[PDB]
Design an enzyme around this catalytic site. Structure first.
Site, PDB file in Angstrom:
ATOM      1  N   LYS A   7      85.488 -26.217 -19.680  1.00 50.36           N
ATOM      2  CA  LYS A   7      84.180 -26.743 -19.757  1.00 50.36           C
ATOM      3  C   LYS A   7      84.034 -27.517 -18.530  1.00 50.36           C
ATOM      4  O   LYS A   7      84.684 -28.743 -18.525  1.00 50.36           O
ATOM      5  CB  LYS A   7      84.101 -27.236 -20.996  1.00 50.36           C
ATOM      6  N   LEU A  23      82.761 -17.669 -17.952  1.00 51.21           N
ATOM      7  CA  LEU A  23      82.591 -17.312 -19.249  1.00 51.21           C
ATOM      8  C   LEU A  23      81.343 -17.677 -19.941  1.00 51.21           C
ATOM      9  O   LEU A  23      80.940 -16.700 -20.527  1.00 51.21           O
ATOM     10  CB  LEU A  23      83.790 -17.859 -20.175  1.00 51.21           C
ATOM     11  N   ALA A  55      73.392 -24.611 -21.128  1.00 49.70           N
ATOM     12  CA  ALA A  55      73.098 -26.094 -21.204  1.00 49.70           C
ATOM     13  C   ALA A  55      74.270 -26.939 -21.449  1.00 49.70           C
ATOM     14  O   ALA A  55      74.581 -28.146 -21.125  1.00 49.70           O
ATOM     15  CB  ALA A  55      72.190 -26.360 -22.461  1.00 49.70           C
ATOM     16  N   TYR A  56      75.219 -26.270 -22.055  1.00 53.89           N
ATOM     17  CA  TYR A  56      76.518 -26.944 -22.182  1.00 53.89           C
ATOM     18  C   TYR A  56      77.504 -27.321 -20.912  1.00 53.89           C
ATOM     19  O   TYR A  56      78.232 -28.092 -20.873  1.00 53.89           O
ATOM     20  CB  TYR A  56      77.730 -26.048 -23.308  1.00 53.89           C
ATOM     21  N   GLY A  57      76.626 -26.818 -19.837  1.00 46.55           N
ATOM     22  CA  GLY A  57      77.051 -27.031 -18.472  1.00 46.55           C
ATOM     23  C   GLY A  57      77.816 -25.716 -18.035  1.00 46.55           C
ATOM     24  O   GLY A  57      76.867 -24.722 -17.937  1.00 46.55           O
ATOM     25  N   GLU A  58      79.088 -25.598 -18.173  1.00 43.47           N
ATOM     26  CA  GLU A  58      79.593 -24.281 -17.824  1.00 43.47           C
ATOM     27  C   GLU A  58      80.927 -24.132 -18.288  1.00 43.47           C
ATOM     28  O   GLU A  58      81.880 -25.052 -18.343  1.00 43.47           O
ATOM     29  CB  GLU A  58      79.368 -24.053 -16.145  1.00 43.47           C
ATOM     30  N   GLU A 114      77.589 -19.740 -19.321  1.00 43.20           N
ATOM     31  CA  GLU A 114      76.790 -20.406 -18.525  1.00 43.20           C
ATOM     32  C   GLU A 114      75.453 -20.824 -19.215  1.00 43.20           C
ATOM     33  O   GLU A 114      74.930 -19.967 -19.740  1.00 43.20           O
ATOM     34  CB  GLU A 114      76.289 -19.623 -17.408  1.00 43.20           C
ATOM     35  N   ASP A 118      76.823 -28.391 -35.740  1.00 40.62           N
ATOM     36  CA  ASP A 118      76.114 -27.394 -34.987  1.00 40.62           C
ATOM     37  C   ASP A 118      76.748 -26.054 -35.103  1.00 40.62           C
ATOM     38  O   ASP A 118      76.942 -25.339 -34.368  1.00 40.62           O
ATOM     39  CB  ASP A 118      75.896 -27.846 -33.712  1.00 40.62           C
TER      40      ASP A 118
HETATM   41  O1  LIG Z   1      85.942 -24.657 -26.211  1.00 46.00           O
HETATM   42  C1  LIG Z   1      84.972 -23.708 -25.701  1.00 46.00           C
HETATM   43  N1  LIG Z   1      83.526 -23.756 -25.566  1.00 46.00           N
HETATM   44  C2  LIG Z   1      82.832 -24.953 -25.508  1.00 46.00           C
HETATM   45  C3  LIG Z   1      83.097 -26.230 -25.477  1.00 46.00           C
HETATM   46  C4  LIG Z   1      82.295 -27.189 -25.338  1.00 46.00           C
HETATM   47  C5  LIG Z   1      80.892 -26.932 -25.277  1.00 46.00           C
HETATM   48  C6  LIG Z   1      80.480 -25.538 -25.415  1.00 46.00           C
HETATM   49  C7  LIG Z   1      81.337 -24.490 -25.571  1.00 46.00           C
HETATM   50  N2  LIG Z   1      80.972 -23.160 -25.583  1.00 46.00           N
HETATM   51  C8  LIG Z   1      79.775 -22.900 -24.845  1.00 46.00           C
HETATM   52  C9  LIG Z   1      79.306 -21.106 -24.994  1.00 46.00           C
HETATM   53  N3  LIG Z   1      79.563 -20.698 -26.570  1.00 46.00           N
HETATM   54  C10 LIG Z   1      80.607 -21.084 -27.170  1.00 46.00           C
HETATM   55  C11 LIG Z   1      81.068 -22.870 -26.972  1.00 46.00           C
HETATM   56  C12 LIG Z   1      85.586 -22.422 -25.400  1.00 46.00           C
HETATM   57  C13 LIG Z   1      86.974 -21.858 -25.457  1.00 46.00           C
HETATM   58  S1  LIG Z   1      87.034 -20.551 -25.171  1.00 46.00           S
HETATM   59  C14 LIG Z   1      85.321 -20.279 -24.837  1.00 46.00           C
HETATM   60  C15 LIG Z   1      84.889 -18.916 -24.467  1.00 46.00           C
HETATM   61  C16 LIG Z   1      85.695 -17.769 -24.454  1.00 46.00           C
HETATM   62  C17 LIG Z   1      85.073 -16.440 -24.325  1.00 46.00           C
HETATM   63  C18 LIG Z   1      83.711 -16.688 -23.889  1.00 46.00           C
HETATM   64  C19 LIG Z   1      82.948 -17.621 -23.925  1.00 46.00           C
HETATM   65  C20 LIG Z   1      83.331 -18.973 -24.373  1.00 46.00           C
HETATM   66  C21 LIG Z   1      81.524 -17.309 -23.778  1.00 46.00           C
HETATM   67  C22 LIG Z   1      81.625 -15.642 -23.882  1.00 46.00           C
HETATM   68  O2  LIG Z   1      83.087 -15.263 -23.688  1.00 46.00           O
HETATM   69  N4  LIG Z   1      84.628 -21.430 -25.210  1.00 46.00           N
END
Ligand SMILES: O=C(Nc1ccccc1N1CCNCC1)c1csc(-c2ccc3c(c2)CCO3)n1
Length: 257
Positions: A32, A9, A13-16, A11, A116
């Protein structure tokens, strides 16, 4: 694990972040994977229980790889709903803003600041309901009814409040309010107003000088622009608070497409 990792979903710096499906109950969640401290992130996540905040389901440690199980938001990132140079329909923006405020009010109510806020971290579920995500920079700003001033430099430049660049210590709440204002600007104009709110940034100086005939302000209607004038105030002590945002005219304007 009884969870199958079905697709990448996110990719970065947050890792993946992967989509995981339970090969039993068939429930879907986001995962995550790592593999700026997991301990604190998990601890903060365990405190969260709100409809506009990504839910935390649990964590698992395998080798040197931590797994954070989170609420899946099939709608993806708010960022992808923002058309470059255009933004989005005002009614959509108002609805997302309302949901963003509810989420932030909730966090601040439990003494947590996100630090953030930006469209990349605001996710949408199948019903296009907004959810605040990524608490990797989040911290406690109120404990035992005692507020603590922040001093750490963090966030994302275009979204960070000016006091964070100038003051040694600052209140947490006005910072999150400011970033929400930058998000509102992006939603209505499809562009960020400045690279950073610094004395050396021409675009920021233009705003302070009320040069609203310039982009992106010229693309924004008078009602939402008046709200942005109250949010994007340099002096955090004079900045509008959320209780007052909720009384704003545009905030309370009935809108439909
Ligand atoms: O908790 C979540 N993420 C999450 C948790 C910790 C750090 C970073 C993240 N992400 C990184 C990518 N951008 C969003 C925040 C999370 C829960 S659902 C989801 C998600 C769902 C669909 C999707 C993406 C992320 C990226 C594009 O399509 N992400």
């Amino acid at each position: 694990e009884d969870w199958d990792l079905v697709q990448t979903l996110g990719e970065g710096a947050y890792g993946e972040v992967q989509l995981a499906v339970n090969r039993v109950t068939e429930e879907a969640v986001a995962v995550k994977i790592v593999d700026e401290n997991i301990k604190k992130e998990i601890c903060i996540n365990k405190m969260l229980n709100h409809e506009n905040v990504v839910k935390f389901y649990g964590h698992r440690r395998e080798g040197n790889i931590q797994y954070l199980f989170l609420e899946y938001c099939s709608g993806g990132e708010l960022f992808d709903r923002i058309e470059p140079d255009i933004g989005m329909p005002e009614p959509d923006a108002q609805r997302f803003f309302h949901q963003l405020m509810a989420g932030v009010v909730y966090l601040h109510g439990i003494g947590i600041t996100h630090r953030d806020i930006k469209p990349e971290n605001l996710l949408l579920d199948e019903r296009d309901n907004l959810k605040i995500s990524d608490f990797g920079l989040a911290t406690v700003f109120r404990y035992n009814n005692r507020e603590r001033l922040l001093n750490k430099m963090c966030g994302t430049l275009p979204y960070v409040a000016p006091e964070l660049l100038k003051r040694r210590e600052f209140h947490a709440e006005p910072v999150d309010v400011w970033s929400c204002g930058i998000v509102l600007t992006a939603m209505l104009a499809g562009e960020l107003p400045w690279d950073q709110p610094s004395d050396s940034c021409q675009e920021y100086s233009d705003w302070k000088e009320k040069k609203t005939y310039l982009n992106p302000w010229k693309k924004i209607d008078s009602a939402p622009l008046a709200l942005l004038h109250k949010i994007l105030v340099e002096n955090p002590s004079a900045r509008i608070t959320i209780p007052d945002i909720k009384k704003d005219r545009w905030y309370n304007k009935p809108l439909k497409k």
